[PDB]
Amino acid sequence: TNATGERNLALIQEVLEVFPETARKERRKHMMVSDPKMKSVGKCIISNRKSQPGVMTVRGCAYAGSKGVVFGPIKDMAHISHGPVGCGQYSRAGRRNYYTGVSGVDSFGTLNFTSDFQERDIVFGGDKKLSKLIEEMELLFPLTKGITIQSECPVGLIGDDISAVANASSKALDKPVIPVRCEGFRGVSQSLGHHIANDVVRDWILNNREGQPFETTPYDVAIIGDYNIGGDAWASRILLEEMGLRVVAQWSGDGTLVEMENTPFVKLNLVHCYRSMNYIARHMEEKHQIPWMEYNFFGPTKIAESLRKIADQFDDTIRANAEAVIARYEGQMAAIIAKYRPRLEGRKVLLYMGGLRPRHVIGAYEDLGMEIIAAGYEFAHNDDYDRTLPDLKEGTLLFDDASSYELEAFVKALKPDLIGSGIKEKYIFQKMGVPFRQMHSWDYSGPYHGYDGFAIFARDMDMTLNNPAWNELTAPWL
Amino acid sequence: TNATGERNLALIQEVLEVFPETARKERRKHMMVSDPKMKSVGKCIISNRKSQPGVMTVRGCAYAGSKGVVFGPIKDMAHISHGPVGCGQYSRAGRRNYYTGVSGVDSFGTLNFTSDFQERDIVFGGDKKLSKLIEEMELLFPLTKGITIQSECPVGLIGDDISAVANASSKALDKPVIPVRCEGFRGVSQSLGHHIANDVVRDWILNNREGQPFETTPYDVAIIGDYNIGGDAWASRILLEEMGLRVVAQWSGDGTLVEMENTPFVKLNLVHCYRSMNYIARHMEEKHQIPWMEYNFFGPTKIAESLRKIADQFDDTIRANAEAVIARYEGQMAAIIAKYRPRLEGRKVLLYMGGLRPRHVIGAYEDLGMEIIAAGYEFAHNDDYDRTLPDLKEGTLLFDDASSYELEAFVKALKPDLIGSGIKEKYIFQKMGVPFRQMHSWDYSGPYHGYDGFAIFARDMDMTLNNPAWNELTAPWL
Amino acid sequence: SQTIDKINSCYPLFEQDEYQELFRNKRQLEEAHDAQRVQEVFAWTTTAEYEALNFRREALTVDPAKACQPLGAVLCSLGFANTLPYVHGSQGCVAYFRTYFNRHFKEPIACVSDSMTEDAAVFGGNNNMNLGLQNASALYKPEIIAVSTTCMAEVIGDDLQAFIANAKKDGFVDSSIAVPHAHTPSFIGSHVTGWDNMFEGFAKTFTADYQGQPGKLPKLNLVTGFETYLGNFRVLKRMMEQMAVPCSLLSDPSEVLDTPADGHYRMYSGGTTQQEMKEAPDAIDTLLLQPWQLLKSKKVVQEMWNQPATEVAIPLGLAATDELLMTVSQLSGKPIADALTLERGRLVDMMLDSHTWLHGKKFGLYGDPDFVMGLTRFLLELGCEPTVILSHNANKRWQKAMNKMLDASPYGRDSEVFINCDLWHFRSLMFTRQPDFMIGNSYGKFIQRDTLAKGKAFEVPLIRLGFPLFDRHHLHRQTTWGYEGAMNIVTTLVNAVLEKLDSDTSQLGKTDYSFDLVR
Amino acid sequence: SQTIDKINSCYPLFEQDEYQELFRNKRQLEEAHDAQRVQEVFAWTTTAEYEALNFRREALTVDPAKACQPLGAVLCSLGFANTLPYVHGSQGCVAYFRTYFNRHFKEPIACVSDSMTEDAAVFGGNNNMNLGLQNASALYKPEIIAVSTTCMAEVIGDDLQAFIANAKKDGFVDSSIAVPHAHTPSFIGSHVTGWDNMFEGFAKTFTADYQGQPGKLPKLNLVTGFETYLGNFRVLKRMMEQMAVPCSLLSDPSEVLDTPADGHYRMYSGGTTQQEMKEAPDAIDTLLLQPWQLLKSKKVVQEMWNQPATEVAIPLGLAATDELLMTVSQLSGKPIADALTLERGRLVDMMLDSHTWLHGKKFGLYGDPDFVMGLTRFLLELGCEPTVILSHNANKRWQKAMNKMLDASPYGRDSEVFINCDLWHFRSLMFTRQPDFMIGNSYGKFIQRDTLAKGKAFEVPLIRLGFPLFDRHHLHRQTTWGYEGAMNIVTTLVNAVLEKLDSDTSQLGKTDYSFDLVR
Numbered sequence A, B: 001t002n003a004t005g006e007r008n009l010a011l012i013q014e015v016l017e018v019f020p021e022t023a024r025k026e027r028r029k030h031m032m033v034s035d036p037k038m039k040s041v042g043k044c045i046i047s048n049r050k051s052q053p054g055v056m057t058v059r060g061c062a063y064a065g066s067k068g069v070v071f072g073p074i075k076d077m078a079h080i081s082h083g084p085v086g087c088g089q090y091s092r093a094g095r096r097n098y099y100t101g102v103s104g105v106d107s108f109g110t111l112n113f114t115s116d117f118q119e120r121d122i123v124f125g126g127d128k129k130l131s132k133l134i135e136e137m138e139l140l141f142p143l144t145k146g147i148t149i150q151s152e153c154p155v156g157l158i159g160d161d162i163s164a165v166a167n168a169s170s171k172a173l174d175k176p177v178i179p180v181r182c183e184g185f186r187g188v189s190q191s192l193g194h195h196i197a198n199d200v201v202r203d204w205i206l207n208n209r210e211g212q213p214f215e216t217t218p219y220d221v222a223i224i225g226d227y228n229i230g231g232d233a234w235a236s237r238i239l240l241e242e243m244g245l246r247v248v249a250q251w252s253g254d255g256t257l258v259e260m261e262n263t264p265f266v267k268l269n270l271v272h273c274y275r276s277m278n279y280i281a282r283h284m285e286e287k288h289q290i291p292w293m294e295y296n297f298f299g300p301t302k303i304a305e306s307l308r309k310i311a312d313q314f315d316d317t318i319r320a321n322a323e324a325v326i327a328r329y330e331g332q333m334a335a336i337i338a339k340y341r342p343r344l345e346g347r348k349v350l351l352y353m354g355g356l357r358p359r360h361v362i363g364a365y366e367d368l369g370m371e372i373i374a375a376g377y378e379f380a381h382n383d384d385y386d387r388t389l390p391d392l393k394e395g396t397l398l399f400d401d402a403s404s405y406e407l408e409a410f411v412k413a414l415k416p417d418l419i420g421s422g423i424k425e426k427y428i429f430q431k432m433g434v435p436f437r438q439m440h441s442w443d444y445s446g447p448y449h450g451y452d453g454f455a456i457f458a459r460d461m462d463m464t465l466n467n468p469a470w471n472e473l474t475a476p477w478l
Numbered sequence C, D: 001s002q003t004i005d006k007i008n009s010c011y012p013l014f015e016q017d018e019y020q021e022l023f024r025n026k027r028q029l030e031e032a033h034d035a036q037r038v039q040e041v042f043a044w045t046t047t048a049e050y051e052a053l054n055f056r057r058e059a060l061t062v063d064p065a066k067a068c069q070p071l072g073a074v075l076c077s078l079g080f081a082n083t084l085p086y087v088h089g090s091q092g093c094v095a096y097f098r099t100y101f102n103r104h105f106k107e108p109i110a111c112v113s114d115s116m117t118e119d120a121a122v123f124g125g126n127n128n129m130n131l132g133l134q135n136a137s138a139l140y141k142p143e144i145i146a147v148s149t150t151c152m153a154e155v156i157g158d159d160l161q162a163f164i165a166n167a168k169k170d171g172f173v174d175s176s177i178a179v180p181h182a183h184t185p186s187f188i189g190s191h192v193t194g195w196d197n198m199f200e201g202f203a204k205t206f207t208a209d210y211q212g213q214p215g216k217l218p219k220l221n222l223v224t225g226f227e228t229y230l231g232n233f234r235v236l237k238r239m240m241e242q243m244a245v246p247c248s249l250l251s252d253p254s255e256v257l258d259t260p261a262d263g264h265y266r267m268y269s270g271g272t273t274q275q276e277m278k279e280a281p282d283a284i285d286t287l288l289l290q291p292w293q294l295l296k297s298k299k300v301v302q303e304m305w306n307q308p309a310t311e312v313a314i315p316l317g318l319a320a321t322d323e324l325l326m327t328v329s330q331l332s333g334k335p336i337a338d339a340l341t342l343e344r345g346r347l348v349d350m351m352l353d354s355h356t357w358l359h360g361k362k363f364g365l366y367g368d369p370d371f372v373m374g375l376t377r378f379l380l381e382l383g384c385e386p387t388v389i390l391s392h393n394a395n396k397r398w399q400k401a402m403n404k405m406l407d408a409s410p411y412g413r414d415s416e417v418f419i420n421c422d423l424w425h426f427r428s429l430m431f432t433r434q435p436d437f438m439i440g441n442s443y444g445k446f447i448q449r450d451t452l453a454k455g456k457a458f459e460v461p462l463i464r465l466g467f468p469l470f471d472r473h474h475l476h477r478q479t480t481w482g483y484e485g486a487m488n489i490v491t492t493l494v495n496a497v498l499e500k501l502d503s504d505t506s507q508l509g510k511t512d513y514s515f516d517l518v519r
């Protein structure tokens, strides 16, 4: 490897000396240094394993992956956090999966519906309480299109059968009532929640309009895996519709049960988040013969590449439309590079997020002249690590399911100019004097997808990297 | 006198003992104890004299009486505070003389126009600056109906001639431009400013529509001396119109130059503030043969008396209307008294205000069973004290131009349950543990005139006299 | 599209014509209810009819106003020196506790899990505890590892005490490390229950076998319970220093929740020391400042430490602060400091100066049981009417005491108290009872929005006092207890009145006859 | 009409149908301009054409942002122990000074006049001065009578010094009373000039014959100048105590402007003592904290007391507070206290936590010269853009310094500085330059109202920082200097941004896609 790769291998060694010998050996398999001649990670890294006990993993649980990520954004359904009160309260409106509607009336994403388990429910089971809750839900929220039941930890442990309740209640209400066994003890992270949720959509939603007439066009597509953080999916959909495509569905940012049921009628599935929804895309290819492709709408290089590749799946009219859309936004893109690249170029970034963004945003940083010196994921699988390798410079530190100790030690040693990570990481690194942008919530900004999102992303990296307060952490008498 | 009277005469002697001899003897003639068989004060009290130097009088100046009280309220005219910057700034929107309009465009009461005298204006005179000021005002404030020039102390002292300026500017603008020599050193208090202002109105406004067509009715009246504090004049106007009268003009609360110019065409002048506008009422009687009468719209006993006397100047139709209006509000009155009198009955009140309210509000307090134990005025004249005598219980302390020292000493000895006075008195007496209501600005409430105002008055006296914080001035361990 | 000179974030980007058109086109693919039907249903949700149906709920909870036990244990644990909160169970819980406190305090929050998964569901979580204590000790070097539990651990019945003994005996965690524990089932009570349970575990660990003697130290201990205003820990210490009465707060997270941004990350800062907790039984007494939630802590004080546990009301407001200082004076024998009497008089001066805007104003309020009782009390003392009073996690004994307090007051005649009711209940009450203002946490913003959508005349503005406060910054630094905190509350209430009155009177030519300069 | 169960005050009483009918009827007697014409003129007052004519004014002032000299002499005088402010001249002035401060501080304000009238205009006011001193002494028993003047006294040429010398000679004022004086002509400068002039009068009276020796006392004097935040006097004393550096404030009215409501009125309380003023020449140095207005006070310190008069910037913001503490440390030889470095780091944490809402925000601001320079400097330090900066009473030398500071900052590129301009000039600048927010005093409410009448998109909300603050309560208790004051400023600015963003995103079904719970 190069001199960076060597410094990073020595750093891995030095950081892991703190761990008890067993954990140390185990953790050494979760980090590596990139090689531009490598097409696949092979044995260089492992991932999607259990977290080490007690190390302060960043990871969440399967309910976060199912309720928090995949189903919670669907605006026309009511999602029940079924179990004790915590899970639903902590995840109430924490994720900025934007949608339009009238809250509590035709759209329900900011309400927290829960069965608020008490000891009586643990002792006698919660299925009767769940059935009565669903009756009260229908009386008070009549315009729901469907209801989901998001299991928390106790539900499967006490032996409840929410699928029996969902079947009975669906008949009673004559609306889809969908049971999800996404108890947080399952799996190792948010990731199994995604997979669980995709299997539930496969069985309980996707076949609901099978055999029915549906008026198609030759250019029908679905956005698969964009949760519209700060309106990211709207900033993506606009480009696809400007290119002459009809976006029949968006999964699941600003999404609806209806759109999901109409997804089997499209011509092409466009997968943005591969980790969370590749499962259902593969299922639609095998059952419905709908092709799918991965794309990336972060920054001008990736956007143009994506628009051209998506348009190449259709015909010359859509191919010409892709060139027209790219030409239409080229002046905006040139102005953004001219104003912000000189303020950011040369600066070094460390990224740590969940399962997509740690690789996906690299192009946009590179468009602004920045360099990624380390990238990690909370819960990605080795096929995500494989997909990260083409966008890393040789010797970059690449790592998986880091503890807070390990992130802090990497930051202290590597001295990135800017960090992109989450809310639990933000206030630690700011106190260490490192500019920090939340790359899950967009630090209450965004969108970052699309052409309109690239302007905001550039504005935001400059605002934070170059803020005058970073020159004031040391008192002037020290 | 009676026992109460003797205690007050002894209190007078004790309070004045602190004064140097010269002042002591002079101050003794500004206080007395009332006698219910007395119809005139005669030699018993003196008033409208200079104040004693150094004593912390409550009084203001003639600019306060002219600009602040009489002219300031007229909404459709721009009033220029002419001299250095203080006067106009301290009096900017202090007095709640309510009006409706579009600020800065067709109504100007909350703007502070000033000629901001600098040293060069004192050395070389301000008339050239004033003339230029008025040209600039006409350019930037084209919708004024007229302009007034309110002189502050320096103007006359440096020998300026604002009348020549006003005549020249009025010709150039083709609008009334009214010069007022209301310099604050003239006279002894706010009172001379009233008188100056009435004389100015007499000569520069009142004759502007002589001989011009005006469509009258038999029941045309003007409200003279109601400055619409908290909407008081609106709450009075509504009753007069309900009784079948047409209120052609309101002087000067929510007033206009036009209304004032139409006042010589009314049938009857209705004087509420005798002190500030008796001068112009007498003048209109002499010159235009318009009868005038004093009335009082504080509380139901005085309102009924006033409605009946006003209606007795007309015909049997307005007399019947007076009875019908009183009957229409009887229920409202009885419910206010039944709710609030029991909470206030028997409590004792000390009042200290300008030139009218110290006697004018007594009936309203009596309508809630409250008793006035001391009443004084800042700047009233002996005819005002004459007018106070009918409404005091024998032995009540009646006083004029009290210093802070005297008012504090009176309050410590009399121990009123409630004080009504101004903003410079409020925070002193609250720290002394005495419930206090501002009875100039209505402590940001009102209106207090009329039937709608009596309800607010009662609510407010109860709110403050019975507030639970008055039982907390002494720490519980003391 | 975007212009280079003025880039628009999400709002107001999506207000642009191209995005309004985009939304019209997407709406055609959603099978949206018709706009008149949505309007009809929204109007129906604001009615008394809907409210009666809403108040028939027995199983569904909507927009709860409480959180689960371990959250409270974590906060308790953060208040001790060199302590690492550790939650035995499933890891999702710990990501959420950290994030929830991160967004209120704007600060890092240290907390670990032992990541129990399906394997631990079958065998018990003993291996996770052993490895978790060893790895946590190695990486974070705590003096104290303060263990609580998630609901999975509770359902499966892991024996915490036995696991922790087994870890030390087997060499997974050094014996010198203190490892207090508590069972914190999220299906019992709420986050305030967790805090009290965690405190009982610290008291057992540090004092079980101690032969204490009350008054051997001439100090008083103070126990705050679950509290998320930094200024309340600090004002208590400041007042005790003015009283010249030695004091320890037992659980004080106010330094670890406010470390400086000076180029260093400090996982640990300040906090109750082991010496302060070990010598707690020797104090004259321990004052439990949120009495409704400090139930097991009162049993510690009286049964384990043989101290009075002198009853004190939450020190919120003028009268309740007076009572706290008279109690401190009686127990210590020291006089109330002249600086405190001066501060008291300045609060009374503020109250007198602002009373005409507060008298007779109607408020809705919700929160934890101790806080709601305290703030209801002070509102009555101000001459305000707390007409709608809700505490989701309160019990019938608390509700009886609340109605007793309200019935005795001239200002409690129109007051209704609700327990075991949530913010979807509170939302209906804001529509039907229409108080002038509501006092709540950031979840109340949705209710304010909902009431405004009925019309400007129906809007009930939110005043933020409570937890969590996620949509304004640095309110967590404030004080709400003592005379200092009452000054904050008075100023906040009066200025909320005045801001709304200005907004209502700010329509040029229409309502600005009453847009007074001076108020 | 009124109903017994809900009595309405003026607003909203006059919204009732019967009053709307009354107004439509009354309007017919006013010869009102038609609504279309009034609309056309209002719109024209928002334009660039109207602005150009507005900025051609040379004689008319509209909505000034300054007051007159004697107001500031009164406030300086209130800051000395047992001192009665006395203004020689016409009494209307004293009624207005008292009222102006009563409405900002919500407190009583002692001040007398000697009531010069027409007789004194012809004879000069020596008889008023004699009797005035005699009567004020008898009634109010001050230790110090601090005399300033009204414009009548200035124009007529009353020889203040001679008058007081005659009152003393003739026994109208006893030898036990000190009578410092200053000439304070309202047609020169503004209220800040009167404060500085009054301070020079106190310096002459108490120190002119004293043979001082800088550093004989190991202390620093601090001079605030005209300042109406009680917290700024307090924070300075608290920081000096933490530094362990003896200090006196010379003029400190914070006790007499905050006396307790305990059943007693106290005309005098606290204040700089005669001992402090008389021993001021022996300090190491005197630090003039508002340097632009403390012009004669600087001559005092250097020419009379032969002290350095070490230059210091107004201690507003992070860097200016660091510079004040480094100056105190250097002059005293004492290190900066660890508690102050801790507080500094918590302010920096706050700045970093809130920076994404403040960066790039555009502000208009106005006020006194020293305050506007300090607040502009701190806004630049936050990465805000102070685009419209106005100080009615600032001079050309201040403007040159402001432009030098702004030219040297990346955040000052679009900033424009206006002196000798008023709030009608500021109103046009809010319409034409439209900053996000404007920082000002209560007179700025009318400019917010005017901008909202053009449309919701054009509204510029007011953030209240300055004097006078008449339409909110108890903001005069706050702090704006030091780290403590900067924490107030940062919190105030970011929560104004967030309150405005919530309001903008609070329309159900329309803009509430971005009504985020967490910000």
Ligand code: CFM
Pocket (backbone or CB within 6 Å): A065, A069, A095, A190, A227, A229, A273, A274, A275, A276, A353, A354, A355, A356, A357, A358, A439, A440, A441
């Ligand atoms: S941490 Fe995405 S695989 Fe999943 S909530 Fe964030 S890097 Fe998730 S891109 Fe997505 S919208 Fe996410 S940011 Fe895949 S959905 S479990 Mo936390």
Ligand code: CFM
Pocket (backbone or CB within 6 Å): B065, B069, B095, B190, B227, B229, B273, B274, B275, B276, B353, B354, B355, B356, B357, B358, B439, B440, B441
């Ligand atoms: S103190 Fe009226 S003679 Fe004049 S401003 Fe108040 S008791 Fe005046 S009633 Fe009137 S509206 Fe007044 S309240 Fe005559 S106008 S100089 Mo200060």
Ligand code: CLF
Pocket (backbone or CB within 6 Å): A061, A062, A063, A064, A083, A084, A085, A086, A087, A151, A152, A153, A182, A183, A184, A185, C068, C069, C070, C090, C091, C092, C093, C094, C096, C149, C150, C151, C152, C186
């Ligand atoms: S891993 Fe995930 S968030 Fe954790 S419980 Fe399990 S589904 Fe839920 Fe829930 S109520 Fe509280 S937060 Fe837990 S202890 Fe239970």
Ligand SMILES: [Cl-]
Pocket (backbone or CB within 6 Å): C292, C293, C369, C393, C394, C395, C398
């Ligand atoms: Cl309870």
Ligand SMILES: [Cl-]
Pocket (backbone or CB within 6 Å): D292, D293, D369, D393, D394, D395, D398
């Ligand atoms: Cl200047």
Ligand SMILES: [Mg+2]
Pocket (backbone or CB within 6 Å): A100, A101, A102, C027, C032
């Ligand atoms: Mg919709």
Ligand SMILES: [Mg+2]
Pocket (backbone or CB within 6 Å): A427, C105, C106, C107, D349, D350, D353
């Ligand atoms: Mg922080």
Ligand SMILES: [Mg+2]
Pocket (backbone or CB within 6 Å): B427, C349, C350, C353, D105, D106, D107
């Ligand atoms: Mg006060």
